Amino acid sequence: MRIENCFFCGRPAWPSKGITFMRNDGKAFRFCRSKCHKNFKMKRNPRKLKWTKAYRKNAGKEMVVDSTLQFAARRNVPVRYNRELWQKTLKAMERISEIRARRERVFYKKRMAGKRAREVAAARKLVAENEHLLPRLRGSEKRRLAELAAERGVDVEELEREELAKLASKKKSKAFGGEVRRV
Amino acid sequence: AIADVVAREYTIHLHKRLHGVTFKKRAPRAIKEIKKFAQKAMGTSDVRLDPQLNKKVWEQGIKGVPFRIRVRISRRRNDEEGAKEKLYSYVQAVNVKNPKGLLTSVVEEE
Amino acid sequence: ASTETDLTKKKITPMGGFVRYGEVNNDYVMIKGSVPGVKKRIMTLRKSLFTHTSRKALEKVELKWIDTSSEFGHGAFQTAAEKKQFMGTLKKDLQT
Amino acid sequence: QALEEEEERLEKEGFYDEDDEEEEEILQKAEYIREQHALIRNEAKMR
Amino acid sequence: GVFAKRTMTKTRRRLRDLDQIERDLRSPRHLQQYKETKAAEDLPGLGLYYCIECAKWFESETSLVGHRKGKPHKRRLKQLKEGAYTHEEAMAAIGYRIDNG
RNA sequence: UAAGGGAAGUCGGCAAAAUAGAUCCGUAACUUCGGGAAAAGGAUUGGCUCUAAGGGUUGG
RNA sequence: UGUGCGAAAGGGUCCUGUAAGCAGUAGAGUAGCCUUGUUGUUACGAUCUGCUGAGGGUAAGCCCUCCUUCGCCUAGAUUUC
Ligand SMILES: [Zn+2]
Known part of the structure; x- marks a missing residue:
């Protein structure tokens, strides 16, 4: 047996999975699932459906140029069976898989490099426009810190900073409404 | 170990409790499952809902009940004379940014 | 669930487990066809009362492959490693 | 063998080499601001 | 409008493909x-008036020149300009290939 | 709602499905010349950005 | 009193199909300001591209989780040679 691939989306097609369409010109179309089969019957383009490997290649979101992608091919010239060749092939398959995985991760990071700079710029703009929503001590808490600093001879700004630390550590959500007392 | 008067915040997954329910009955059943959840959590058969919690349930009509709702249930003492139940639960809706990703928490008394 | 021609090291349990059952961690019996019960149900296996008369009883079974894809949907992968290898890197992979 | 030679060449060149407190603080403050905006929108949706 | 839209996706109503x-x-x-x-x-029209792009027969030259101004013909032109989806593109999408010696 | 088939069903296509608005091409026999006729058979219809035509008053 | 039960949550597995928002010498054209055109410029503008197989849902008859949190427990009532 062998593992085929879906014509429409590109997923691995295993035995008894999906359905094959035989056309009168002599071409056969293997689909992994009824989703791909029904989209094909609705004449949707796989290149425009964003969940397909066709779209991902056309958008450049899959690693398409690599040395590790040259090892798998449809071999139309058979090789006489050789036990040593098959075992070294299996070892090659493992090593190729590992190398391909690391190179794919590098490719994804090179796609996603600029995110940190964009997010930092957006955060700076948001903070600059909304400085007034930053956490703040209560007026009663400020007065109590001021009188405690006057009593203990300590720094009111210092007391304010550890109180900001405490109210930053303690997160309390507010509830809607409230019970009405019965008569 | 746990006192009679106690408030906890819970996340009720109303989606699995309203799966397959008739459209004209989804929101009233949601009210009843909120009462049943509070009774199971606090042991109190007397459950009183906040009108804001009712608005939160009914916000998108009779069949647009949210999948998750973040509630605070407060078990309190019934001080009214001649009361069959000495304890009751009061359930309020909680203002959180997103009802997902939250654990059951105990509300501080202060 | 590994065979002599499929060298993938894997157990009989599908991805995501058996639907409404769980995971098979004990010895299991694979039976051609269907059986009278449902999932979770107690099955009684019995020896045949008579000597068999068919060649199918004397046939030796050689498995080439066992499906271990998910039965909670249209599963296309036999292992989670295969799913990761096909999909590639995700957003949560860099976030973690 | 060619793949292994290319791989060791790339590791020598730093192909697989992987790489601020002020940035972390400004991101945390932005997340706090977004949470406050969500709470304000929830109050409006309630009322 | 599409005639009998309910059974449009049946095999006995199938249209010619873009490839x-x-x-x-x-x-x-x-x-x-x-x-x-x-x-x-x-x-229609004894086969004398045929649009290859739309894979469709028409009753007259006036009717054919008429549909050419319409948007279905223009969508067919746009799809042909983009290119139909085929097996070699499907193979390149997964990075597979054929070794013929 | 239903794959494939498409009246094989039934006394009988009963019931259902199919058609349908508008613009344009086009429209037979028959006829009391008025009709038939929306006969039949076809092409098309979204959004957006534009262009053109269709008026009134004042001014030498 | 447990390899317990329940409510959440995390992970998985599936379904859909790429979220809000921001940005772009992408964008048919149109109108202003001036260097009167040299992406002239600014503005509007279906859509496209990137952030983004993302966002959302997931047991209600899916799976895993002494070792992610919180809670519950040795009852109550009735009957029996
Ligand atoms: Zn497919």
């Missing part, structure tokens, strides 16, 4: 085979 349309445009022998598959006397 076959590309083959018909590039090679006249393929189009000749497709036309020999049909009977000319039962065709």
Whole structure:
């Protein structure tokens, strides 16, 4: 047996999975699932459906140029069976898989490099426009810190900073409404 | 170990409790499952809902009940004379940014 | 669930487990066809009362492959490693 | 063998080499601001 | 509007595909085979007025020049300009190939 | 709602499905010349950005 | 009193199909300001591209989780040679 691939989306097609369409010109179309089969019957383009490997290649979101992608091919010239060749092939398959995985991760990071700079710029703009929503001590808490600093001879700004630390550590959500007392 | 008067915040997954329910009955059943959840959590058969919690349930009509709702249930003492139940639960809706990703928490008394 | 021609090291349990059952961690019996019960149900296996008369009883079974894809949907992968290898890197992979 | 030679060449060149407190603080403050905006929108949706 | 939209996706209502349309445009022998598959006397306008892009027969030259101004013909032109989806593109999408020696 | 088939069903296509608005091409026999006729058979219809035509008053 | 039960949550597995928002010498054209055109410029503008197989849902008859949190427990009532 062998593992085929879906014509429409590109997923691995295993035995008894999906359905094959035989056309009168002599071409056969293997689909992994009824989703791909029904989209094909609705004449949707796989290149425009964003969940397909066709779209991902056309958008450049899959690693398409690599040395590790040259090892798998449809071999139309058979090789006489050789036990040593098959075992070294299996070892090659493992090593190729590992190398391909690391190179794919590098490719994804090179796609996603600029995110940190964009997010930092957006955060700076948001903070600059909304400085007034930053956490703040209560007026009663400020007065109590001021009188405690006057009593203990300590720094009111210092007391304010550890109180900001405490109210930053303690997160309390507010509830809607409230019970009405019965008569 | 746990006192009679106690408030906890819970996340009720109303989606699995309203799966397959008739459209004209989804929101009233949601009210009843909120009462049943509070009774199971606090042991109190007397459950009183906040009108804001009712608005939160009914916000998108009779069949647009949210999948998750973040509630605070407060078990309190019934001080009214001649009361069959000495304890009751009061359930309020909680203002959180997103009802997902939250654990059951105990509300501080202060 | 590994065979002599499929060298993938894997157990009989599908991805995501058996639907409404769980995971098979004990010895299991694979039976051609269907059986009278449902999932979770107690099955009684019995020896045949008579000597068999068919060649199918004397046939030796050689498995080439066992499906271990998910039965909670249209599963296309036999292992989670295969799913990761096909999909590639995700957003949560860099976030973690 | 060619793949292994290319791989060791790339590791020598730093192909697989992987790489601020002020940035972390400004991101945390932005997340706090977004949470406050969500709470304000929830109050409006309630009322 | 689409005539009998309920059974549009049946196999007995199937239309010619865009890759076959590309083959018909590039090679006249393929189009000749497709036309020999049909009977000319039962065709609209005796088969004399045919749009290869829309893979469709028309009753008159006025009708054919008429549909050419319409948007279905223009969407077919746009899809042909983009290119039909084929097996070699499907193979390149997964990075697979054929070794013929 | 239903794959494939498409009246094989039934006394009987009963019931259902199919058609349908508008613009344009086009429209037979028959006829009391008025009709038939929306006969039949076809092409098309979204969004957006534009262009053109269709008026009134004042001014030498 | 447990390899317990329940409510959440995390992970998985599936379904859909790429979220809000921001940005772009992408964008048919149109109108202003001036260097009167040299992406002239600014503005509007379906859509496209990137952030983004993302966002959302997931047991209600899916799976895993002494070792991610919180809670519950040795009852109550009735009957029996
Ligand atoms: Zn597929």
